[PDB]
Design an enzyme around this catalytic site. Structure first.
Site, mmCIF file in Angstrom:
data_model
loop_
_atom_site.group_PDB
_atom_site.id
_atom_site.type_symbol
_atom_site.label_atom_id
_atom_site.label_comp_id
_atom_site.label_asym_id
_atom_site.label_seq_id
_atom_site.Cartn_x
_atom_site.Cartn_y
_atom_site.Cartn_z
ATOM 1 N N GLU A 1 54.112 42.505 66.812
ATOM 2 C CA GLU A 1 54.815 41.227 66.859
ATOM 3 C C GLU A 1 56.319 41.388 67.010
ATOM 4 O OE1 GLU A 1 55.997 38.915 63.063
ATOM 5 O OE2 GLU A 1 54.075 39.851 62.566
ATOM 6 N N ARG B 1 63.173 47.411 61.976
ATOM 7 C CA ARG B 1 63.112 46.321 61.008
ATOM 8 C C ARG B 1 63.876 46.762 59.765
ATOM 9 N NH1 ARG B 1 59.880 43.870 56.731
ATOM 10 N NH2 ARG B 1 59.442 41.674 57.231
ATOM 11 N N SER C 1 56.866 32.111 58.774
ATOM 12 C CA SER C 1 56.341 31.917 57.427
ATOM 13 C C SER C 1 57.235 32.610 56.408
ATOM 14 C CB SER C 1 54.908 32.444 57.340
ATOM 15 O OG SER C 1 54.078 31.825 58.309
ATOM 16 N N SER D 1 61.778 38.211 58.868
ATOM 17 C CA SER D 1 61.987 39.595 59.265
ATOM 18 C C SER D 1 63.365 39.714 59.898
ATOM 19 C CB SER D 1 60.912 40.073 60.250
ATOM 20 O OG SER D 1 59.634 40.098 59.639
HETATM 21 N N1 LIG Z 1 54.641 21.693 63.490
HETATM 22 C C1 LIG Z 1 54.893 22.630 62.504
HETATM 23 N N2 LIG Z 1 53.944 22.958 61.633
HETATM 24 C C2 LIG Z 1 54.234 23.855 60.714
HETATM 25 N N3 LIG Z 1 55.384 24.472 60.564
HETATM 26 C C3 LIG Z 1 56.379 24.195 61.399
HETATM 27 C C4 LIG Z 1 56.159 23.245 62.415
HETATM 28 N N4 LIG Z 1 57.299 23.129 63.133
HETATM 29 C C5 LIG Z 1 58.212 23.956 62.614
HETATM 30 N N5 LIG Z 1 57.680 24.622 61.549
HETATM 31 C C6 LIG Z 1 58.394 25.614 60.736
HETATM 32 O O1 LIG Z 1 58.274 26.896 61.326
HETATM 33 C C7 LIG Z 1 57.661 27.812 60.405
HETATM 34 C C8 LIG Z 1 56.686 28.718 61.158
HETATM 35 O O2 LIG Z 1 57.403 29.387 62.196
HETATM 36 P P1 LIG Z 1 56.794 30.604 63.055
HETATM 37 O O3 LIG Z 1 57.908 31.296 63.770
HETATM 38 O O4 LIG Z 1 55.812 30.087 64.054
HETATM 39 O O5 LIG Z 1 56.081 31.644 62.059
HETATM 40 P P2 LIG Z 1 54.678 32.432 62.024
HETATM 41 O O6 LIG Z 1 54.648 33.464 63.118
HETATM 42 O O7 LIG Z 1 53.617 31.390 62.242
HETATM 43 N N6 LIG Z 1 54.489 33.124 60.555
HETATM 44 P P3 LIG Z 1 54.549 34.756 60.616
HETATM 45 O O8 LIG Z 1 53.142 35.297 60.596
HETATM 46 O O9 LIG Z 1 55.265 35.300 59.404
HETATM 47 O O10 LIG Z 1 55.210 35.163 61.908
HETATM 48 C C9 LIG Z 1 56.909 26.962 59.374
HETATM 49 O O11 LIG Z 1 56.859 27.638 58.117
HETATM 50 C C10 LIG Z 1 57.811 25.713 59.287
HETATM 51 O O12 LIG Z 1 58.859 25.912 58.337
HETATM 52 C C1 LIG Z 2 56.603 41.111 59.068
HETATM 53 C C2 LIG Z 2 55.665 40.116 59.747
HETATM 54 S S1 LIG Z 2 54.624 39.293 58.504
HETATM 55 O O1 LIG Z 2 53.556 38.523 59.145
HETATM 56 O O2 LIG Z 2 53.845 40.258 57.727
HETATM 57 N N1 LIG Z 2 55.579 38.285 57.507
HETATM 58 C C3 LIG Z 2 56.398 38.805 56.422
HETATM 59 C C4 LIG Z 2 55.880 39.712 55.510
HETATM 60 C C5 LIG Z 2 56.674 40.188 54.476
HETATM 61 C C6 LIG Z 2 57.987 39.758 54.360
HETATM 62 C C7 LIG Z 2 58.865 40.272 53.218
HETATM 63 C C8 LIG Z 2 59.359 41.709 53.379
HETATM 64 O O3 LIG Z 2 59.634 42.148 54.443
HETATM 65 N N2 LIG Z 2 59.486 42.517 52.180
HETATM 66 C C9 LIG Z 2 59.941 43.849 52.153
HETATM 67 C C10 LIG Z 2 61.191 43.979 51.283
HETATM 68 N N3 LIG Z 2 61.004 43.373 49.925
HETATM 69 C C11 LIG Z 2 61.594 43.886 48.705
HETATM 70 C C12 LIG Z 2 61.255 43.303 47.483
HETATM 71 C C13 LIG Z 2 61.870 43.851 46.330
HETATM 72 C C14 LIG Z 2 62.761 44.915 46.473
HETATM 73 CL CL1 LIG Z 2 63.554 45.636 45.049
HETATM 74 N N4 LIG Z 2 63.009 45.387 47.668
HETATM 75 N N5 LIG Z 2 62.439 44.882 48.759
HETATM 76 C C15 LIG Z 2 60.416 42.004 50.023
HETATM 77 C C16 LIG Z 2 59.175 42.014 50.906
HETATM 78 C C17 LIG Z 2 58.504 38.848 55.267
HETATM 79 C C18 LIG Z 2 57.709 38.373 56.298
HETATM 80 F F1 LIG Z 2 58.214 37.482 57.197
HETATM 81 MG MG LIG Z 3 55.783 34.810 63.875
#
Ligand SMILES: Nc1ncnc2c1ncn2[C@@H]1O[C@H](COP(=O)(O)OP(=O)(O)NP(=O)(O)O)[C@@H](O)[C@H]1O
Ligand SMILES: CCS(=O)(=O)Nc1ccc(CC(=O)N2CCN(c3ccc(Cl)nn3)CC2)cc1F
Ligand SMILES: [Mg+2]
Ligand SMILES: Nc1ncnc2c1ncn2[C@@H]1O[C@H](COP(=O)(O)OP(=O)(O)NP(=O)(O)O)[C@@H](O)[C@H]1O
Ligand SMILES: CCS(=O)(=O)Nc1ccc(CC(=O)N2CCN(c3ccc(Cl)nn3)CC2)cc1F
Ligand SMILES: [Cl-]
Ligand SMILES: [Cl-]
Ligand SMILES: [Mg+2]
Lengths: 352, 352
Positions: free
Chosen positions: A121, A190, A175, A178
């Site tokens: 991703e 990252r 959600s 990153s």
């Molecule tokens: N129609 C919608 N429905 C839900 N969330 C929305 C919508 N429009 C905007 N958002 C916001 O956009 C966020 C999701 O963004 P997005 O970039 O698509 O993440 P994601 O890829 O689905 N999650 P991740 O797996 O961590 O990448 C949601 O948490 C909301 O805060």
């Molecule tokens: C990546 C695509 S995803 O789909 O998996 N989404 C997703 C998943 C995880 C995270 C959080 C993350 O990156 N963390 C690593 C660093 N961390 C800590 C915590 C305590 C300490 Cl002392 N130090 N570091 C917090 C957690 C964000 C995402 F957006």
């Molecule tokens: Mg995403």
């Protein structure tokens, strides 16, 4: 086989589709009716089912991709509705990315002879970001910033040039969050992430305000006063904390005034929605600045759908970054902020 | 005049009091009855009014301060009740620090001929921290850590030596969070801070669970399951995100599962209390690690009253710091974690 790119995230599925517009009369006859019915279905409608939406305003037109001229379309629907999407398809090589490419891999293979190729991703994010900015937004700049973000009477959207984009700090607000350091087209990492992202805003706002949609939460937030819930520096010091450059308006404790029962009873749901937005946005901006200072990168670009139709968070990120960096860091934004993973996946099709 | 040190914070007032125990028979006669009534009142009671508490277990005994042998006492009460404290005093040089030293300066001067000397809350924090560790906790170590914090069957409290404490990263978790880089006894700086602190935990938990005290919120959190509200990496990927070293149990989106109505209806208040604690604690640990890597400091000490009687956050900070740093950073804790500002203020008395 149609040319798709899919980013199945934790919340939303993003789909990039390349519609050929240089179809010859011979190619039109050889076009299978199922292939033609799909193209007409996607180009004749802007709403698919009850939850699918085509962002028509983001469409790239007359794009030359893989030696063909065509239009690039951008479509989204909730990941919760992917079973419906797959079931419709059960009645073609799919480059898929995001967490759902692995979680729903067996479900995609229920589609007969479908070849699923999983891509990372963040590879697709970098590749899709650099590609869209390179081909421009129909002649307009893909990247923009808010000039004079500290002066509201002068704050205005202005184009920004990324013709050499390195180095670059990418903050992907989905959600979760990153944060990537892009040193080259083949050298990125990252640096970190935080779990306080768009899902935290939508999750907390649903618990606190009973909002039923992302757009409704933003609408409540625009009507609220976050200082009704947050404790400010002036609430603790009676003014500025001048010794460490903290202005009186700075938030000292998010939701900190909600430790008092009388203030919990007078706060409105719009105030709590606004406080949730400010809390999530400020924390993301602060983490971005810390990573930027560490990575020695002064250009920070924010992507992800948390900023979709969300001008409040964008301007807050713009003012916060500029103020707390003393002008050293720049907040950048992209018109196709939510679709770069889906584009990067589509660009992996020749590699298969 | 009694020897006091006061740290008036955004939430709690912390008071350090030095009780002389080498009083001669001549000094006892010259002791004003109002001065003797105060000493007997503070040493004969452990609860003052309805909200004052003396932390008897933290008392330092037979301490030689300012050439006198005495006992150092530690007392706390809510800042909300400072008007009662001042009104009792209206029926002496006060070294006061924290935001309330400036906000309530005019209120202290309602006490006849009282001399109020304001000191900075982070100067007193550094001076008080180094002093308490230098005189030890009645022969025991003031500083401790959790050995083998990644293995729960081996995680245990162990003393830690700070005989040369530099460099040091101090994370002050109060209403908000301040992070300090201590390079010397006269060379320290505030690197950054975040508004997601103890007030955010107490404020959000009051809104979400209706808890009426900090201790009740911790009690709810100990009975909850934060994964009922948070969206995990395994909820998005179906497992680990191996490419970027993210385990399946890692929180991807705090409160991210609360975007679904069915999960909001089945979640318990203990789950929301636990999710609030985990969310605040993880974010603080991540910001501390980022500042530690930037400041090139491998010893991070967490203070403030958010960790008072809060072993869940301490062990979470211990495991998180160790795991995400690959063993490079150490989470440290102090027995007098909430009172260092009040001690530092008291130590400024000879300078007046
Ligand atoms: N129609 C919608 N429905 C839900 N969330 C929305 C919508 N429009 C905007 N958002 C916001 O956009 C966020 C999701 O963004 P997005 O970039 O698509 O993440 P994601 O890829 O689905 N999650 P991740 O797996 O961590 O990448 C949601 O948490 C909301 O805060
Ligand atoms: C990546 C695509 S995803 O789909 O998996 N989404 C997703 C998943 C995880 C995270 C959080 C993350 O990156 N963390 C690593 C660093 N961390 C800590 C915590 C305590 C300490 Cl002392 N130090 N570091 C917090 C957690 C964000 C995402 F957006
Ligand atoms: Mg995403
Ligand atoms: N009895 C209590 N009442 C309130 N909060 C408590 C109590 N015990 C522990 N806490 C926690 O400790 C936090 C306050 O810690 P503290 O270090 O005293 O900050 P502060 O100095 O009052 N605020 P600040 O002005 O930013 O320094 C609260 O937000 C709670 O999370
Ligand atoms: C200090 C004693 S206090 O009583 O006043 N409490 C107190 C007050 C304020 C704070 C927060 C703080 O330090 N901030 C500066 C850095 N910041 C940002 C935001 C966005 C961006 Cl892009 N960059 N930086 C967030 C706010 C914590 C506290 F614990
Ligand atoms: Cl594959
Ligand atoms: Cl003074
Ligand atoms: Mg304090």
């Amino acid at each position: 086989s149609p040319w798709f790119g899919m980013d199945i995230g934790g919340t939303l599925v993003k789909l990039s589709y390349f519609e050929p517009i240089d179809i010859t009369a011979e190619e039109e006859q050889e076009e299978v009716e199922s292939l033609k019915s799909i193209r007409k279905y996607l180009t004749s409608n802007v709403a698919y089912g009850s939850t699918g939406i085509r962002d028509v305003h983001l469409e790239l037109k007359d794009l030359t991709l893989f030696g063909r001229r065509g239009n690039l379309h951008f479509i989204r629907f909730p990941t919760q509705d992917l079973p419906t999407f797959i079931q419709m398809g059960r009645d073609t090589v799919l480059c898929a990315t995001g967490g759902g490419a692995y979680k729903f891999e067996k479900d995609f293979r229920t589609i007969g002879n479908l070849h699923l190729h999983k891509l990372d991703e963040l590879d697709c994010l970098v590749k899709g970001l650099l590609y869209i900015d390179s081909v421009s937004f129909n002649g307009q700049a893909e990247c923009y910033y808010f000039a004079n973000a500290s002066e509201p009477e002068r704050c205005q959207k202005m184009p920004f040039n990324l013709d050499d984009p390195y180095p670059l700090l990418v903050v992907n607000i989905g959600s979760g969050v990153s944060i990537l350091a892009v040193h080259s087209k083949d050298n990125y990492k990252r640096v970190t992430g935080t779990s306080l992202g768009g899902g935290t805003f939508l999750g907390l706002c649903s618990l606190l305000t009973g909002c039923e949609s992302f757009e409704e939460a933003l609408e409540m937030a625009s009507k609220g006063d976050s200082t009704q819930a947050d404790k400010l520096v002036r609430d603790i010091y009676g003014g500025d904390y001048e010794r460490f450059g903290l202005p009186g308006w700075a938030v000292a404790s998010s939701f900190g005034n909600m430790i008092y029962k009388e203030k919990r009873e007078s706060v409105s749901k719009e105030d709590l929605a606004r406080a949730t937005l400010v809390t999530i946005t400020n924390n993301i901006g602060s983490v971005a600045r810390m990573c930027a200072v560490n990575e020695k990168i002064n250009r920070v670009v924010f992507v992800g759908n948390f900023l979709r139709v969300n001008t409040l968070s964008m301007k807050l990120l713009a003012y916060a970054l500029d103020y707390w960096s003393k002008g050293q860091l720049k907040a950048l934004f992209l018109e196709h902020e939510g679709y770069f993973g889906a584009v990067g996946a589509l660009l992996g099709l020749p590699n298969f």
